[PDB]
Amino acid sequence: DFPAGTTPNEHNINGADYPRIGEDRRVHFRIHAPNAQKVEISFRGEMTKEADGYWSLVSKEPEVIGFHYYQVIIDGVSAADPNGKPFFGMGKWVSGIEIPEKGVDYYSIKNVPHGLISQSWYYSDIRKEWRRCIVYTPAEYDKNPTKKYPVLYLQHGMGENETSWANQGKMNFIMDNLIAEGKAKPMIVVMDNGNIEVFKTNSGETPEDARKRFGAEFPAILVNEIIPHIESNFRTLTDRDNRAMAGLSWGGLLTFNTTLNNLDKFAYIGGFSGAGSIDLKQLDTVYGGVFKNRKAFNDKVHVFFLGIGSEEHPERTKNLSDGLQAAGINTIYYESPGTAHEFLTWRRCLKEFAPLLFK
């Protein structure tokens, strides 16, 4: 029946025997499409025609560990694999390949207490719309009725939305395991929508104009609508020492703009392969001069975390970190070995960052 040494991809729907993952980390795709002229797998090129109207494709080389978005492409039309569970990435609902790592389980389901992942609705006056945020509460939450928790606000990048961290990010098992093992403080995590699903430039706009607009309302939405909603409906501490924020990719830039313009509300800042930048040549004036007084900044911001995959040009982020440190701004630098601009890098970033919070 199936090629030797393959198991079904973890993100297949029940009953779907393909795609399959092999012990050599090659992926095996197989689709019945007798009336199609051409079938591709995103980022992998064309499949081969087989008997009985089937198409196959096997990774030319071992694939990289971690999570990878994919779609099937039928005569040029990209769609989610009918065999797959859905993930929101690349601006729509697509599919996901999972390549297992050896000797790793911090994002696996273990026999420890599991927090809830909850859908929570609130109205936004800024955007004149109902919005849904995703909230992790720790497993001990309901059994500690008088306790208040600190909050981490955790943001996605471009082409993602409020569901991505808990879905392809596996963030709830990361938090469950970290908390069970005593490595991170029991905390609430709030995951909302940056409104950066699809990047568009309007006809009168320069590229700079469009980037400046891209998710530009999120800082105000977070500080003026998400925080009040969260504090009204969950048992939270509300002082700055108990409020953290991290974002991946463009979400790292939203995090820089939210937190560094609202230091009275945030004391922990995390960029995961962030698009946020700091002009070292202007350290004393950028962001309204909050970096000028080194001790005051280092005293106010307890964790300033910069993460990056080793296969996505780490030198830019390492140069920024080394530059900040040489000027007297504390940073935590983390480099994810073997990974690039994909979710395994950010799973590792969360596992490294969450233990540093609220201590």
Next chain:
Amino acid sequence: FPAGTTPNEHNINGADYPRIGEDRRVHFRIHAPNAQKVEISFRGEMTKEADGYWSLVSKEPEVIGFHYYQVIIDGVSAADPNGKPFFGMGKWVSGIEIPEKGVDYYSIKNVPHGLISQSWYYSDIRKEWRRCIVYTPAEYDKNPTKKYPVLYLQHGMGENETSWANQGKMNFIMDNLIAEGKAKPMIVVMDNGNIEVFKTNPEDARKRFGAEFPAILVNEIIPHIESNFRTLTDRDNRAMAGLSWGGLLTFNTTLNNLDKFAYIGGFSGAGSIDLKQLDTVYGGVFKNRKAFNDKVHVFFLGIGSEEHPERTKNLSDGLQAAGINTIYYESPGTAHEFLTWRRCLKEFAPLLFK
């Protein structure tokens, strides 16, 4: 955009098609320059347009409510890349929502909203971790020592534990019912019947289909819910309802465990009862009419007017003629789709725990 059309509710952000007209015709538009043939499921081929686009407008007005669909590219069925996902027909597909006039109980309103939560537990019976979906009422955490009655709510064949809270819109149905004082604040638990795909190894497969779910619910789900949510755990505070094959699962669970359930609902259910053996079926639980009617406070049988209600109406009438109380509900204008079951939930949940 054509006059009098609006984007379908279940589009992703930025998707302008498909759209819904005021006449309830659906407008599909797909960019497929290099495809020989493009279809929409249950509506035939689309028309080749300029720019390598394809278009399709419903021939006749479509029925109110929710309808699964896929786009078909040269014979390969797939979810609409413009659409949010719904689990139905055994995979993740797409959904059309045809609005109703003057109806809002499954809409989002300016009322308190309960959480929809994901909760994990291990099942010895199936040797696997499993996720359940749990509605807690809006007041849940504002009343830290209150305990709540529980409704276990099950999907049909081809669906799973997410179907009720997505295409079923049950969290807003509950929010509105609770806010208006028509249902008691309650916890609702939606699990996976393991009936995504029916496939054989004859009618022996039907005996096996979902057969472990009664044991899973009673021996694994309920102890997990009760350890982790503030719940009332006596039989008068536990209900169960299910749609289609879930209705069969509900009959087999509740009637063989009457010491645990006091409310039973079948929404277009496949559950049956041979009236000619009413006295012996299910272990004879029905033989003593008064004992049954005092134990089971609500026995609800819902059906759509357009999916042959007569066999449900006859069961309800025959039970009543034999002395077994029932509540019969007929959804006018709907068939074996999800608006029928949204309406069943809207009718059933106000009857519970009173």
